Design a protein around this nucleic acid. Structure first.
Lengths: 51, 92, 41
RNA sequence: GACCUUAAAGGUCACCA
RNA sequence: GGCGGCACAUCUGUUACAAGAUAACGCAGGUGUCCAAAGAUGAACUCAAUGAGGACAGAAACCUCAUGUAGAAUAUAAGGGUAUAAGUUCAUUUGAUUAUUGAUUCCAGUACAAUCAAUAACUCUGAAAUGAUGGCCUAACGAUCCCUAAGAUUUUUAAUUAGAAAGAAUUUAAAACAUAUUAGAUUUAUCUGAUGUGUGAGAAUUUCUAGUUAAUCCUUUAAUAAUAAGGCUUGGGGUGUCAGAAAAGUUACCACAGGGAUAACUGGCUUGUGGCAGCCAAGCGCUCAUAGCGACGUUGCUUUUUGAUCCUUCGAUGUCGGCUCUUCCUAUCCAUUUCAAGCAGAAUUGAAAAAAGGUAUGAUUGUUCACCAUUUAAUAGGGAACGUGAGCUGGGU
RNA sequence: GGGAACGGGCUUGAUUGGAACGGCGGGGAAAGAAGACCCUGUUGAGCUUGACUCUAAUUUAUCAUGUGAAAU
RNA sequence: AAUCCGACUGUUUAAUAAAAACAUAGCAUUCUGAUAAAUCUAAAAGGUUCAUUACAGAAUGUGAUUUCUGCCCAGUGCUCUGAAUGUCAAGGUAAUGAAAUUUACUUAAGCGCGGGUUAACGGCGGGAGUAUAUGACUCUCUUAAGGUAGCCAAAUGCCUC
RNA sequence: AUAAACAUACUUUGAAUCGGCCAAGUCUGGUAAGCAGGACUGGCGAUGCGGGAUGAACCGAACGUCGAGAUAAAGUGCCAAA
RNA sequence: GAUUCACGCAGUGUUAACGUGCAAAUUACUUGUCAUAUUUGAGUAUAGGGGCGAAAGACUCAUCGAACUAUCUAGUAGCUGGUUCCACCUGAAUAUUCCCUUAGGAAGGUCAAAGUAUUAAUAGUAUUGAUUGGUAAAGAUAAUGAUUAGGUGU
RNA sequence: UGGAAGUAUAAAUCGAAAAGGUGAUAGUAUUCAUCAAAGUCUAAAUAUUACAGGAAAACUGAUAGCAAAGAAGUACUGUGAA
RNA sequence: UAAUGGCGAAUGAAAAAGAAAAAGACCAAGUUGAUA
């Protein structure tokens, strides 16, 4: 037999993520003293659409 | 088929006719230290799978009957083979 | 050649589509370690 | 027609051209 | 070819041809068993059937006499054999045993298997001669390697007692240390030198008779021991494809070496089957076997159906039908000429000469074939590589 | 006619004047291709499956000696 | 004017098949809390979905809409949040023996035992009476269930033109 | 009785071959076959020559190169010798 | 992801042309399609039990039900084809046994060549003598069977 | 591996010594024989179809002998290996 | 050849003995420590 489509998916040649116009990694900020024992205030500059 | 024990037949060691006890011969326990078994175990070791033929086309349904006629007074054992029989029994 | 489901003179599977979790990659096609099948009630 | 089964009757086969 | 079967190991009768051999997927059947008795022996008896008798009892229960060449029985398929038995009954028994030779049947004069003839033991039965190495005979079965059992003590040696008989033994350079005895060191399983003698030394051994003890089938290669293992001889575990690999399918996506040793198409032999034609005459035909038919039988022709065979073609003969076109056969549908009728006329029916001329249009189907609707004087049947694909078409396959 | 059972050559006949042009598709069992159908090879390959023998991945047990404790 | 197939737009055997085949939206099922699921690699602070996080990722069947998806868990799969003392390896422990060896006891998964599951693979019966015919009705055999709603000489029906 | 000394008995080494086919005062299966399979012998294969017009097998007869004669199967109206 | 025309593109039909072609797949007309699941250039990524595939076993340089190229390799072939001068002499085979054997092998028969032995070591023949066998024929109240009738007796 | 109850190497586990290894049939014991592993070096006798320089030949003599007797790994083909 | 081997096909050494040539030296450990 051949190699099925699920096998060819794990090599990542044409199945790589199409992430060129993505905004970036979306996550909390890195933990520090000011988040452990205080509060840091942030300003929501804009709301954007992540592809 | 049916053959009694306690036969009176010739015993070569005593050179005389003595009473003899008759039983049936059963194949003994296969040993793990005979040369043929040691050779076979060595060959089967390693890759290659089954290295010796395996019989799978049996056709016979019966076996020849071998009696073990044993001298009572001298322990001298004979081996008499009978014809193939479906049913065998050691009678009186 | 392409798939385990690749059938013959009638489009059909042929063997059960529920498979063990331990199936090698290549034959693990369909429902995997399925505790149940059919429409749920 | 061939194989099988029952107490004549069924059942399966009868393909490549 | 497949499916079916086993003609693959194997027995009987027959084909089979009066020595031996001997074919077909020829005919009628059979084996992969069964038997402590259904082996061995001794003795007694005679079977199947029939007739005639005897309470219940009769067609069939048990008893008696007579006839009784086997017409019964002998484990089984068939064929052979068997009557003071090879059959039935009674009694004893285990030779259905160990060892060694020589032959005969398949035979390549190989193996297995089988069939015999003797010899050396120990036995069985019988008064005895004899008989007994499985079954009354012809089938009832199996290599190398591997596994697993039984056997190899009869005899041969060594040592020590007692007796007896022959026996010189080869000839100079030496280390292993068993150690004693000292000179050092040590505490630990304590070692390290040197002095010293024998050892180990050489200018008895064998045979044999009677004992006693011990060992005793061969080998594990320096020597022994108990275990283990391997040898030698003989059996069992099996190969049924039976002189014996360890083995599921599908390819219409297929590939290669080949094949007319072999199928699907023509052709060739045959003509069962298909088609056509005769001979006799039981009868039908209101009377009348033959106007027209002709049963029960029987003799042919044809190759236009399908079979049967495998001779040609597998480094290829383009495989259905239709369309187009030519020719040929007559077992003639029409037209022409005649004879017959249960031919008054008309329409018809049977037959002869005759193949020069004609024999159509459409619905459905790829169809050949078929079935309908018309028309016509008639809308006959066939061959030519099942005419005709560098003539077409590509509907079917 | 016989022959390998469908001859251009052979046998017996029929018949024949040398060279050929334009057409033609009856024949040369015309050409193209060591038949692709079928069968035989102790020749293969793709694919399938509790065909035989194996194998990666998956899985389970033991070993591979961190400290200080308690229960069986 | 109708019948069949496919819902549609789309794709397809470059060089004999463009289609009823593939895709499709819709419907449904399975697994996974991310140190996971799937999966490439001989190995790897290696790689892909994943610049991701269940409205997600991965594996499948059917093929728009409407109406509806019947019964069967016996067989083979898959699974269980399940049972221990049926069967099960290397090991571990113990005994005899001069020792090899041998013997006994104890060990996990797996299978067996029991349950679940068919929008998992799949399956879904006979015979005889009975109201000029038919047979609502009845008897009888025995399946895990006996083909239900529908549809039909159909691109599916041999007989069959 | 007849024949047999280039008679007889061999020994060693080795080639090719085991696809066969035909005839008949023969047989079996089949309706039958230029069908399938056998017993005995002779042939074709391996084989030309004369005759049957032609033909693997039929009849006569088997072959170094030639001359002359008697022949065999079979023929004698012409092809064609008689 | 409506209907159409055009620039373009494809390949439904003629099963047209051509079929030693313009062309190792093209030409003419007809047909379809002709912007969002569209068409297209360059760069870049994926590689042979691999890739890529709106799935045809399709495509992967005219090569794909496993590319191209070189080495193992002059792979093996019980199968097909071919196998080279003259004269002379002798001259066959299709039985039997065994084989995973049936298109092939070994034992054996037939045949050739070498080399021997004075040689109880001749016969595909007939005759005389003693045998063997169960074929053709024959028989059918002669045994086992098959079969048509006619007398006599109870 | 010829090495056969394990000849050699490696991996997992285990792991010595008041030494010990070997005498190829596994095992224990007692003798006998013979060596003293787990570090290193070491000329000579031996091989050679790379390549360079020479000499020979019962070798080939332009379809032969190397593929190449001339600007031969050249002309030419392929994207490329070739 | 011993041996190995579906013990099949096949694989397969070495001591002795005869020659060419010949050649033996070092670390580690131990000892010496006004230590080098």
């Amino acid at each position: 037999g051949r190699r099925t489509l699920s096998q060819r998916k794990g090599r990542g040649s044409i199945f790589k993520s199409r992430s060129h116009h993505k905004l970036g990694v979306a996550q909390h900020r890195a933990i520090d003293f000011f988040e452990r024992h205080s509060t840091v205030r942030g300003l929501v500059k804009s709301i954007e659409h992540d592809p | 088929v049916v053959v009694p024990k306690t036969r009176k037949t010739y015993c070569p060691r005593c050179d005389k006719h003595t009473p003899h006890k008759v039983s049936q011969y059963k194949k003994g326990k296969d040993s793990l230290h005979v040369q043929g078994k040691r050779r076979y175990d060595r060959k089967q070791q390693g890759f290659g799978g089954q290295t010796k033929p395996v019989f799978k086309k049996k056709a016979k349904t019966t076996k020849k009957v071998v009696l073990k006629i044993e001298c009572t007074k001298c322990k001298y054992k004979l081996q008499k083979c009978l014809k193939r029989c479906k049913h065998f029994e050691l009678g009186n | 050649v392409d798939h385990p489901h690749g059938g013959g003179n009638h489009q059909h599977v042929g063997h059960p589509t529920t498979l063990k979790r331990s199936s090698p990659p290549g034959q693990k096609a369909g429902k995997v370690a399925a505790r149940r099948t059919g429409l749920i009630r």
